[PDB]
DNA sequence: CCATCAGTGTACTAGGACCCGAAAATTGAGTTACAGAAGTAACTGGTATACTCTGGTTTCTCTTCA
């Protein structure tokens, strides 16, 4: 149990935002445009 | 008295720099090739600013004819 407390704090100091949530929610992680657009 | 018309007390913007961290990218050493281009590291002339007797000059008494 006190080790899985250790892991969770490396984990808190290793944790990450909203933003990069915002309009084109999808996006690449390699050039982080969106997919193409709906025909709607 | 119901029109009108500043202020007000705020979260909600609007610019406006600015910062914090993460992730990707680079740098760096190690080897060994490869060809050629930089990149200093070296000896070796070449011509002018002082420079040092020196050749001429200049009166100034004198030398030598005349």
Known sequence: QNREQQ???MRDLAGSYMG???K???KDKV?????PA???
């Open 31 to 35: 050039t982080g445009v969106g997919p």
């Open 20 to 22: 990069h949530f915002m």
């Open 38 to 40: 709906n025909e709607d």
């Open 24 to 26: 084109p929610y999808f």
């Open 7 to 9: 892991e969770e704090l």
